Design an enzyme around this catalytic site. Structure first.
Site, PDB file in Angstrom:
ATOM      1  N   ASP A   1      88.422 102.826  42.119  1.00 24.89           N
ATOM      2  CA  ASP A   1      88.649 101.984  40.981  1.00 24.89           C
ATOM      3  C   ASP A   1      89.083 102.962  39.867  1.00 24.89           C
ATOM      4  O   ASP A   1      88.273 103.527  39.135  1.00 24.89           O
ATOM      5  CB  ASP A   1      87.355 101.432  40.519  1.00 24.89           C
ATOM      6  CG  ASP A   1      87.303 100.826  39.278  1.00 24.89           C
ATOM      7  OD1 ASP A   1      88.303 100.254  38.720  1.00 24.89           O
ATOM      8  OD2 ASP A   1      86.144  99.999  39.085  1.00 24.89           O
TER       9      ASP A   1
ATOM     10  N   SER B   1     103.513 100.236  28.393  1.00 24.90           N
ATOM     11  CA  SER B   1     104.792  99.934  28.835  1.00 24.90           C
ATOM     12  C   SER B   1     105.837  99.568  27.888  1.00 24.90           C
ATOM     13  O   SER B   1     105.454  99.184  26.860  1.00 24.90           O
ATOM     14  CB  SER B   1     104.503  98.508  29.754  1.00 24.90           C
ATOM     15  OG  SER B   1     105.696  98.028  30.258  1.00 24.90           O
TER      16      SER B   1
END
Ligand code: 479
Length: 330
Positions: free
Chosen positions: A35, A199
């Site tokens: 994770d 992004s």
């Protein structure tokens, strides 16, 4: 040193991925959910409330000759999905794919919440976010990667998740055979303890690319792709009959649909998520309403590039002095 381990979807939908991890002496192998959005290595154990164990493999520290109670240490974690667990702490030897850390903090669960109990395939979590998020008190502990890093050939790990298929976590090296083209690296903020990056934009299907900054985290421990409501609406608008369902808890679409791809930007590069990756199947057995793999982050407070996004790429978690993230197509 290096390590390399195969990671395997827990079910036919890729709801999560499990990776075998050796703990203790002799080894006890547990299948952990790696994770990159959290920083605790915790396991089902001989200390876990009996009624809260349902098929998981447990760690029994009393059977490990290298286990040592970390005296006075406790831990307690709550994830974004409302799940939680807590307990006490041992140090022990932990190996992943041939890479060994001695003295790793292994957080033994005394209590886990219902969703953990109900998932018989996940024996615990192995956190790979920054150690500043680790919950052990009163002495915060380091992640497996943080402990291994100085020994590694290069201070990196990579995630290569499969679509409906196994994939690979590598530690200490970049497998140049595992991706196509070049790896595009992008800046990371560690301020919130995550692999947080920005992004450069998105496209839906064959549509034009929209240049827009989207700050979010690279999180192997989240199944879906969570993005701003504007972006998510633009995606689902291209699917006939798709709608956001408050009763179901997100966007659903007719199971008869053919989904468009979704592209996200990494600098000037582009990662394409095929439409099929965005199908999470019937909302309930036999339903013709299917759950979407791209959902709004509006209720969450952060955008999350979870498995739906990451599995479309070869992803480098670069733990150099100034961390960065790399993405390649594959
Ligand atoms: C599915 C869940 N994911 C997260 O917690 C992502 C992180 C998240 O939501 C948030 C971060 C900051 C505000 S909200 C999960 C469950 C179990 C283990 N690992 C992850």
């Amino acid at each position: 040193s290096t390590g390399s381990a195969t990671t395997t979807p827990i079910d036919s939908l890729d709801d999560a991925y499990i990776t075998p991890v050796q703990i203790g002496t002799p080894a006890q192998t547990l299948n952990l959910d790696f994770d990159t959005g959290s920083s605790d290595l915790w396991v089902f154990s001989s200390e876990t409330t009996a009624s809260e164990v349902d098929g998981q493999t447990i760690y029994t520290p009393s059977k490990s000759t290298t286990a040592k109670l970390l005296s006075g240490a406790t831990w307690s974690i709550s994830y974004g999905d409302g799940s939680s667990s807590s307990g006490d702490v041992y140090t022990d030897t932990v190996s992943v794919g041939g890479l060994t850390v001695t003295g790793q903090a292994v957080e033994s669960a005394k209590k886990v919440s219902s969703s953990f109990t109900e998932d018989s395939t996940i024996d615990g979590l192995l956190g790979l976010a920054f150690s500043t998020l680790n919950t052990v008190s009163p002495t915060q502990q380091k992640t497996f990667f943080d402990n291994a890093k100085a020994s590694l050939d290069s201070p990196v790990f990579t995630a290569d998740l499969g679509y409906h298929a196994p994939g690979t976590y590598n530690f200490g090296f970049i497998d140049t055979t595992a991706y196509t083209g070049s790896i595009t690296y992008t800046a990371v903020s560690t301020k919130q303890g995550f692999w947080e990056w920005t992004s450069t934009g998105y496209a839906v299907g064959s549509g034009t690319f929209k240049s827009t900054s989207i700050d979010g985290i690279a999180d192997t421990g989240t199944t879906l792709l969570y993005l701003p409501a504007t972006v998510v609406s633009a995606y689902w608008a291209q699917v006939s009959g798709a709608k956001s369902s408050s009763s179901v808890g997100g966007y659903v679409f007719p199971c008869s649909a053919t989904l468009p791809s979704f592209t996200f930007g990494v600098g000037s590069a582009r990662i394409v998520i095929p439409g099929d990756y965005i199908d999470f199947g019937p909302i309930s057995t036999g339903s013709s309403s299917c759950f979407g793999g791209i959902q709004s982050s509006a209720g969450i407070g952060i955008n999350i590039f979870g498995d739906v996004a990451l599995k479309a790429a070869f992803v480098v978690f670069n733990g150099a002095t100034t961390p960065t993230l790399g993405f390649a197509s594959k």
